[PDB]
Design a protein around this ligand. Structure first.
Ligand SMILES: [Mg+2]
Ligand SMILES: [Mg+2]
Ligand SMILES: [Mg+2]
Ligand SMILES: [Mg+2]
Ligand SMILES: [Mg+2]
Ligand SMILES: [Mg+2]
Ligand SMILES: [Mg+2]
Ligand SMILES: [Mg+2]
Ligand SMILES: [Mg+2]
Ligand SMILES: [Mg+2]
Ligand SMILES: [Mg+2]
Ligand SMILES: [Mg+2]
Ligand SMILES: [Mg+2]
Ligand SMILES: [Mg+2]
Lengths: 33, 129
RNA sequence: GGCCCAUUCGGGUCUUGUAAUUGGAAUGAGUACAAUGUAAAUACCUUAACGAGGAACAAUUGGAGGGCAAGUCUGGUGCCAGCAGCCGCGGUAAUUCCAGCUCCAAUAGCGUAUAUUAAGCUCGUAGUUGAACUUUUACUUUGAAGAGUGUUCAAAGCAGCAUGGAAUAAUUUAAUAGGGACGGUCGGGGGCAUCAGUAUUCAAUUGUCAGAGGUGAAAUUCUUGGAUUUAUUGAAGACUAACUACUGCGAAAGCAUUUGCCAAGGACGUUUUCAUUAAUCAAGAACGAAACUAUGCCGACUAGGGAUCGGGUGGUGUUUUUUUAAUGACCCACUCGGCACCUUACGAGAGGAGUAUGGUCGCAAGGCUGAAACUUAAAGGAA
């Protein structure tokens, strides 16, 4: 019970993930482009 | 706050895949969802899918073969240059050659490699891997 | 004999050590007959002669360790331990001393200091987000540090416009989205009247007489002008026992007698209707003595089980009953929506406890009182 669930491996870094979908900031967009 | 139908369909597919369900029912449908599922089917991330006409938006049922790690819709639908594509791939995906970014370009919706092949670009729709 | 490893004991390996003697060769810093350099001159490059063993032609900076006295100091449980030692009996041309103490690192560079990097609840305004379907612009495609070198090496120097574009964003369906309608209902939802209940207090009569309430004992209080208690009756306020449930209703706080009125509400059923009218929302609007042992990982999230409340469909045979009207209760299956309970598949959801104190600030001891400038009365205290 005490042990925290195993959360898998991180597979992306661009932006926050939400129910609507992954969201990218305008600042991020310029940096890539 | 409600979500777009494409986003809801993709979340349903993700959950059904991870729970071990072999077929998932998506409602409502749309042309965009059908094109998205067509791309995924071509690259093998799902099996057959069937469209039921209900005189409403309509319904879809997708058989899952377990090869789907994750799917998602990306917003805001920012534009991408053709030469820029590579950079975006390296950011949105796990590795160089694993996965397919899906783009809405002048010639329709298609994965990023076909977009390179046809020398067409546009906005990004979402990612699959 | 040297060196390497090893907390421990020890283990491993072999040309090592000198704090020994010695030879002839090379050359620059310098010092220079010069010449070149340059307006002249310095510097550079070149070069006669001099220029090396302490090659005294005498680079540094910093760290790690030793050891010594008829020496000095401090604390002890003899002969110790700690700090430490340019200082010792004599001596300064006196002394010849530990190897001139040993080792390590950078080196024309190397240390030090500071900083620095690795209440509540509903509604609701901006903002944000939000079902499906059948010309122009945004957007997008196309066209207008490195190469070489022999400065002796090196640092150097050196020869908006045109154009193609099918998606994406601007420029009929009747969502298991939303709203209303209709039907039988459901409810301890709300407001106004209304009804009932036993109880408490007071009062009226009324039988009897000394105690009655209260605490662990009391005190206080009532009481032969009759308390408490007993019977009958009237009035006042408050409240709604048992039925009372891990049940119902309401946005929350809350709501428990009957009957009527007033509007209101949920879910269910619908082959009725508008047709995206929506979601989340800081701002704003409506309503609105006490605590004192607790506790549940969270979510966009799968399949369930028992039980229960409200509604609907079907089955079935018992309660029910018959041309007055109404017309249910129970059992079983299915379904929608509720309050909870028990399980389950999936998910990046991004200081405590003590110890010591040659410091600073506070608080504190004692000698019998009386009683001292008084060796002093009585009465106490002690014994
Ligand atoms: Mg020699
Ligand atoms: Mg709210
Ligand atoms: Mg608004
Ligand atoms: Mg409808
Ligand atoms: Mg309605
Ligand atoms: Mg109604
Ligand atoms: Mg009522
Ligand atoms: Mg009422
Ligand atoms: Mg009354
Ligand atoms: Mg009652
Ligand atoms: Mg009442
Ligand atoms: Mg009830
Ligand atoms: Mg149910
Ligand atoms: Mg409720």
């Amino acid at each position: 019970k005490a042990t925290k669930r195993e959360r898998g491996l991180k597979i992306s870094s661009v932006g926050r993930s939400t129910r609507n979908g992954l969201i990218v900031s305008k600042r991020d967009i310029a940096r890539i482009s | 706050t409600r979500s777009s139908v494409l986003a809801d369909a993709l979340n349903a597919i993700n959950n059904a895949e991870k729970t071990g369900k072999r077929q998932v029912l998506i409602r409502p449908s749309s042309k965009v969802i059908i094109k998205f599922l067509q791309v995924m089917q071509k690259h093998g991330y799902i099996g057959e899918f069937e469209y039921i006409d209900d005189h409403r938006s309509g319904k879809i049922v997708v058989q899952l073969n377990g090869r789907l790690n994750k799917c998602g819709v990306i917003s805001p639908r920012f534009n991408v240059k053709i030469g820029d594509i590579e950079k975006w791939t390296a950011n949105l995906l796990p590795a160089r050659q694993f996965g397919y970014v899906i783009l809405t370009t002048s010639a329709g919706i298609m994965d990023h490699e076909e977009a390179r092949r046809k020398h067409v670009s546009g906005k990004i729709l979402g990612f699959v891997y």
